[PDB]
């Protein structure tokens, strides 16, 4: 009977919640009460990257921490030299509606995806001096909200059909399909060892997927609104979920539950973009009120504020060496805040 | 200048990319984007054939003006998470079937699509170009049964002049922003041929009024 299957799911939901309450002896806010705070963190705009002509929807640094690709809705995908502010590449796309972009960890490939239900991978380092479409990965039945390169052969895309998928690039095909969400998967993020990844959907829940196995390991039902963005703690044993109810929340995978809440009463608009700094002490959130807050991650209190954007900061990313922070907003400007 | 021989030529590649970014951005700034948002499958496929993967852009050109019509109804996701990409669109081409009032109700479902899109926080200034399709099929549905099936609070008689003027006023009622935006109503069907000419007349009133906010005249 169907009415017994809702029941034994709830009695299994109880023992998850009972074992969640069994392990909460003290919160992370209780341990970091006597710890030196990081003070005011004031970061000046070093570079301001011009040249875009529409709303910037995503960026992604390279592993070399000097190149960043940046998609925008004018149908362009510019690759920047972040030190001396040159455009290395300007890749004209097949459609303007691009909602995410990626950068392969080797540097040879760049994938952008958007409202076309498609993920198109570009080839940077090649003969003929072109940036041509290496592959176009079709099979999603919704807008492709985030794509992240595992390596040069595999890419994990998150679409709005309540499904993440793992692609093979050398033959465009869904290797494993990561089902289990009940809402549009708004943003994913990969673990540093890339055996696991998290994906925060529009059902107030992020998950923890085993990449090689295909299943969902844990379900982190802590929020109350749409999880617009997500990022990993650099240890890989914790993550942070920027929501639409203006609360970043730091979970962790070993304790299976929520640790903190980065809530302030002066903010009411949600978070478009979360990225930890290197060493994971700061938690740079990206809000809709033209702002970026640099939250401490051991204490909850706000350390600094990155103000200077004229529209919604839609994307931010700290470099792999932790030197800079590039927040690309809805006005056609990226800003690099060392 | 303290730049090397390669760093001098990496800046010149950037400044040649900047030339191709402005010359392709000014080409796309002279184009009119029109988010076509016909509710359901009623009347939406008629006016794309009259004027000439999830999102189906239908490019066409009338009187040296290039229109882009982003038929986006084949997405079937949550609408609030990607409708802000269409912020800054010139207009919105809504499509209502006039004859679906007998076919909750289908006409009332297309009012909830209109009410949720005309008071959206992104489209507070994009003028809806409302197309009431199926007019030559709306006349015989009226003469077989009055409007009183769909609309309970109907005071006028059954005939087509009072019914079609009522459904025009029911959709021009759902906007609360009477000062920032306008609703250009047409009464079309499959046999009409002016429906490419009406869009050019309706977007040229939009871009004129959008230009008169820029110079401070309005």
């Amino acid at each position, epitope marked *: 009977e169907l009415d017994q299957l809702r029941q034994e799911a709830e009695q299994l939901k109880n023992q998850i919640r009972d074992a969640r309450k069994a392990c909460a002896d003290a919160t992370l806010s209780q341990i970091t009460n006597n710890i030196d705070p990081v003070g005011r963190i004031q970061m000046r705009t070093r570079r301001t990257l011009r040249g875009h002509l529409a709303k910037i929807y995503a960026m992604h640094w390279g592993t070399d921490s000097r190149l960043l690709v940046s998609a925008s809705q004018d149908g362009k995908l510019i690759i920047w*030299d972040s030190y001396t502010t*040159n455009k290395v590449h300007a890749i004209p796309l097949r459609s303007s509606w691009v909602m995410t972009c990626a950068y392969a960890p080797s540097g040879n490939y760049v994938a952008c995806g958007g409202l076309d239900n498609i993920c198109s991978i570009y080839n940077l380092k090649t003969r003929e*001096g*072109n940036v041509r479409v290496s592959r176009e990965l079709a099979g999603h039945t919704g807008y492709l909200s985030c794509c992240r390169f595992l390596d040069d052969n595999q890419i994990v895309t998150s679409s709005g059909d309540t499904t993440c998928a793992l692609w093979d690039i050398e033959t465009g095909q869904q290797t494993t399909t990561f089902t289990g969400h009940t809402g549009d998967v708004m943003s994913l993020s990969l673990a540093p060892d890339t055996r696991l990844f998290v994906s925060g959907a529009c059902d107030a829940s992020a998950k923890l997927w085993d990449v090689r196995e295909g299943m969902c390991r844990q379900t982190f039902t802590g929020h109350e609104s749409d999880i617009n963005a997500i990022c990993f703690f650099p240890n890989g044993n914790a993550f942070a979920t920027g929501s639409d109810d203006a609360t970043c929340r730091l979970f962790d995978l070993r304790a299976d539950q929520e640790l903190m809440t980065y809530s302030h009463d002066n903010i009411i608009c949600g978070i478009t973009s979360v990225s930890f700094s290197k060493s994971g002490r700061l938690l740079l959130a990206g809000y809709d009120d033209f702002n970026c807050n640099v939250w401490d991650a051991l204490k909850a209190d706000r350390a600094g504020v990155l103000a200077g954007h004229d529209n919604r900061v839609s994307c931010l990313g700290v470099t792999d060496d932790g030197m800079a922070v590039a927040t690309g907003s809805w006005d056609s400007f990226l800003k690099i805040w060392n | 200048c303290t730049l*090397s021989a390669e*760093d001098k030529a990496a800046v*010149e590649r950037s400044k040649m990319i900047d030339r191709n970014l402005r010359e392709d951005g000014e080409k796309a700034a002279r184009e009119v984007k029109l988010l076509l948002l016909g509710a359901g499958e009623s009347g939406k496929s008629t006016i794309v054939k009259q004027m000439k993967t999830g999102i189906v852009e239908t490019h066409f050109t009338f009187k040296d003006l290039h229109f882009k019509m982003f038929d986006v109804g084949g997405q079937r996701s949550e609408r609030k998470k990607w409708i802000h990409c269409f912020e800054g669109v010139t207009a919105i081409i809504f499509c209502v079937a006039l004859s679906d009032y007998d076919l909750m109700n289908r006409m009332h479902e297309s009012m909830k699509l209109f009410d949720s899109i005309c008071n959206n926080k992104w489209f507070t200034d994009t003028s809806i170009i409302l197309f009431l399709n199926k007019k030559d099929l709306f006349e015989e549905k009226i003469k077989k049964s009055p409007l009183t099936i769909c609309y309970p609070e109907y005071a006028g008689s059954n005939t087509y002049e009072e019914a079609a003027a009522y459904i025009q006023c029911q959709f021009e009622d759902l906007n609360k922003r009477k000062d920032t935006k306008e609703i250009y109503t047409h009464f079309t069907c499959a046999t009409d041929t002016k429906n490419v000419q009406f869009v050019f007349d309706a977007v040229t009133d939009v871009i004129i009024k959008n230009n008169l906010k820029d110079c401070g005249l309005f």
Partner: single-chain antibody, 232 residues
Framework: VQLVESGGGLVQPGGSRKLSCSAS????????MHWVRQAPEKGLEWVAY????????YYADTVKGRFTISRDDPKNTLFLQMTSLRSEDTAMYYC??????????????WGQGTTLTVSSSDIVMTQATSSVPVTPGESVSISCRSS???????????LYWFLQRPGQSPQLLIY???NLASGVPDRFSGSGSGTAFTLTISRLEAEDVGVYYC?????????FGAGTKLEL
């Protein structure tokens, strides 16, 4: 990708000739193309350069005001109009693409070359070994020495290592030093001291029998080193 040129032959001394390099197989309008000549018994010397979109144009000291470089981006061809050809212009003119961005490999593909034959402050590189006696399989080392420190302020050291197999055009091996051209084996590696440089070949083979040229790229004119010929 290929670059085939045309022109040359017996020219009267003091005449004129147009050298035409027709580029087929790559995006020609984004490559800042060079012209590099080679005397009949000497090493390379750089002749002319035109950018992408014909922005900047440089020449050597010998051909400034005497030659003229020009490119045709729609027709995908590159020209070199030379007037008053002296008897020191008898050479074989290569046609070298070179794109410049961050992490690019300039000078990567070279044209085949057309034997022209007329009738009858620069960073002075010095490859001291004119010829190295070579047994196959051993580890050989080609040493190049600059006359100005090529290490720029931005960390890059603009020295390029070319190999010209006997009967072929110079192939790029190593761009800005200890890099590697995409397509050459792992056995090549270049470890330099900012002003004195070294090429290391580990497991030598008969495909590496040739002449090795070290080329600066710090400033124009691009002075090539002399020949380091490796013989079995």
């Amino acid at each position: 990708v290929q670059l085939v040129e045309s022109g040359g032959g017996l020219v009267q001394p003091g005449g004129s000739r147009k050298l035409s390099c027709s580029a087929s197989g790559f995006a020609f309008s984004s490559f800042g193309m060079h012209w590099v000549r080679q005397a009949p018994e000497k090493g390379l010397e750089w002749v002319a350069y035109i950018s992408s979109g014909s922005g900047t144009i440089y020449y050597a000291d010998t051909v400034k005001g005497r030659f003229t470089i020009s490119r045709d981006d729609p027709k995908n061809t590159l020209f070199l109009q030379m007037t008053s050809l002296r008897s020191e212009d008898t050479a074989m003119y290569y046609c070298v693409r070179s794109i410049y961005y961050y992490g690019s490999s300039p000078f990567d593909f070279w044209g085949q070359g057309t034997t022209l034959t007329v009738s009858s402050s620069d960073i002075v590189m010095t490859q001291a070994t004119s010829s190295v006696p070579v047994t196959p399989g051993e580890s050989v080392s080609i040493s190049c020495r600059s006359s100005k420190s090529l290490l720029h302020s931005n960390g890059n050291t603009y020295l390029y290592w070319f190999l010209q197999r006997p009967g072929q055009s110079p192939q790029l091996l190593i761009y800005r030093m200890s890099n590697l051209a995409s397509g050459v084996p792992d056995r090549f590696s270049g470890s330099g001291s900012g002003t004195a440089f070294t090429l290391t070949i580990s497991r030598l083979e008969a495909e590496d029998v040739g002449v090795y040229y070290c080329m600066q790229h710090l400033e124009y004119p691009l002075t090539f080193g002399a020949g380091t010929k490796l013989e079995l």
